[PDB]
C-alpha cells in the first residue's frame, strides 16, 4: 500500500478515532509522516 497517493491514505486514516492514529504512526515512515498531518486533528 504505497501506490495510493497521500490524499487517499489520509482518506483512510481520517476514518479512524484519533488515538487510533498512534497505531498507524508506528507502522511506516509514510504512515508516521501522514498520521501527524495537520488535517487529521
Amino acid at each position: 500500500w504505497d501506490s495510493l497517493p497521500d490524499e487517499l491514505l489520509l482518506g483512510i486514516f481520517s476514518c479512524l478515532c484519533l488515538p487510533e492514529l498512534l497505531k498507524v504512526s508506528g507502522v511506516c515512515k509514510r504512515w508516521y509522516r501522514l498520521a501527524s498531518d495537520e488535517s487529521l486533528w
Binding site: 500500500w1 501506490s3 495510493l4 487517499l8 482518506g11 483512510i12 486514516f13 481520517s14 476514518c15 479512524l16 478515532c17 487510533e20 497505531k23 498507524v24 508506528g26 507502522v27 511506516c28
Partner: protein, 116 residues
C-alpha cells in the same frame, strides 16, 4: 440506454448510461467530449467490472457492501484508486472505511503484515 466504456487493457463494457450518475469522470467524458467508446486508461477490466457491479447494485440509492468488499487486499487498494479516478464518492468512502476497519483494533505489527 447504454454506452461503451473501454478499460485500460482494451476490454469493452456495455454499461447503462445511468452509471454517469455515479461516476463524474465518465459523465464528463460522455457529455463534454463525446467519446463514443469512453476510454478509461487508469482502470483495468477486472477492477472496472467490479466498479460497474457496485454501481449497478447502488443505482437505486451497508451489509451488501461488506460482502462485496470482502475481497483480496490488493483489489481493495485498486478499488480505492478506481473510485478516486472515476470520482464515485460512495464507492471511495466505503472502501476507505473498509480499510480503516482492518487497521482498527490492530497493532502496527499486524497492520504491517496484513498490508504487507
Amino acid at each position: 440506454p447504454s454506452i461503451k466504456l473501454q478499460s485500460s487493457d482494451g476490454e469493452i463494457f456495455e454499461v447503462d448510461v445511468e452509471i454517469a450518475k455515479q461516476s463524474v469522470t465518465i459523465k464528463t467524458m460522455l457529455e463534454d467530449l463525446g467519446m463514443d467508446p469512453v476510454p478509461l486508461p487508469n482502470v483495468n477490466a477486472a477492477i472496472l467490472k467490479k466498479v460497474i457491479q457496485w454501481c449497478t447494485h447502488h443505482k437505486d440509492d451497508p451489509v451488501w457492501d461488506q460482502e462485496f468488499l470482502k475481497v483480496d487486499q490488493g483489489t481493495l487498494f485498486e478499488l480505492i484508486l478506481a473510485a478516486n479516478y472515476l470520482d464515485i464518492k460512495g464507492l471511495l468512502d466505503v472502501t476507505c472505511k473498509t480499510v480503516a476497519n482492518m487497521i482498527k483494533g490492530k497493532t502496527p505489527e499486524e497492520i504491517r503484515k496484513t498490508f504487507n
